[PDB]
Amino acid sequence: PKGTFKDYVRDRADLNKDKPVIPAAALAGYTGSGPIQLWQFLLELLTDKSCQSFISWTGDGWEFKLSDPDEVARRWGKRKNKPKMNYEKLSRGLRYYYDKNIIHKTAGKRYVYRFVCDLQSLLGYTPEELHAMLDVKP
Amino acid sequence: PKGTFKDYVRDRADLNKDKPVIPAAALAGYTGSGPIQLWQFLLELLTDKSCQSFISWTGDGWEFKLSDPDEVARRWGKRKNKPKMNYEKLSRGLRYYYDKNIIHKTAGKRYVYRFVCDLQSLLGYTPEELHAMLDVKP
């Protein structure tokens, strides 16, 4: 392409990309879920500094917000090779996690959710630790 | 719950896994190649310290050896969700790269090939540079 592959990688690194704390494929392998799942993908985006403009931790425990839900849906589609992925499907996926108690929606607010499963024990990180590593303001 | 995700990751790191100098996905993205191609996959394995037992650089420029061709094929099939992938198909794939001048086979030797496209200009790395980062004996 333009410059060398080395340039490409350096440019991505400079933009804080390709180094999520919790890579979805890695978490899928660890949990043995086979295919990558939406909740694991959201976790990767939330621990990827380059993604903070469209999805981020609110600073309240495991609560997060979708600043650009369409972008989130777009990336999800690309990751699962489903070009037809959209916000309608993304929201349906999120509602599915309600009864599964993986993700709950924050009442009286919009596009704000919270992981309600025990991620601290599963992941080995506290909300504080993760927020420091990602330099989250709140 | 065999440890935490964090332990799972450190365990793999202690085995020199998950850190290829040239990830196939990244290379495909940079070249705008779409799906990951076999030659890109070989480059990934060749720059992944954890794969040296079945595929490695010979120490002569961009020449490499498939010490365990069957395992290489298995990993390729696994990466592309192609369960039928095996040595016969992998070898067919390699031969296809001949007239495409991407990879040529070293005559007179067994399981030895060489990238013949200009990888130095494409990657930004010299063979010797990669060899050093990978502790190639030779």
From Swiss-Prot, chains A, B:
The gene is Ets1. Residues 127-133 are annotated as: Helix H5. This is Protein C-ets-1. The keyword Electron transport does not apply. Residues 24-31 are annotated as: Helix HI-2. Belongs to the ETS family. Keywords: Acetylation, Cytoplasm, DNA-binding, Immunity, Isopeptide bond, Nucleus, Phosphoprotein, Proto-oncogene, Transcription, Transcription regulation, Ubl conjugation. Transcription factor. Directly controls the expression of cytokine and chemokine genes in a wide variety of different cellular contexts. May control the differentiation, survival and proliferation of lymphoid cells. May also regulate angiogenesis through regulation of expression of genes controlling endothelial cell migration and invasion. Ubiquitinated; which induces proteasomal degradation. Residues 36-116 bind DNA. Changing residue 130 to A: Reduced autoinhibition. It is found in: Nucleus; Cytoplasm. GO terms for cellular component: cytoplasm; nucleus; transcription regulator complex. The modification N6-acetyllysine is found at residue 6. One of its GO terms (biological process) is regulation of angiogenesis. The keyword Cytoplasm applies. GO terms for molecular function: DNA binding; DNA-binding transcription factor activity; DNA-binding transcription factor binding; nucleic acid binding; sequence-specific DNA binding; sequence-specific double-stranded DNA binding. Residues 5-13 are annotated as: Helix HI-1. Residues 119-123 are annotated as: Helix H4. Binds DNA as a homodimer; homodimerization is required for transcription activation. Interacts with MAF and MAFB. Interacts with PAX5; the interaction alters DNA-binding properties. Interacts with DAXX. Interacts with UBE2I. Interacts with SP100; the interaction is direct and modulates ETS1 transcriptional activity. It comes from Mus musculus.
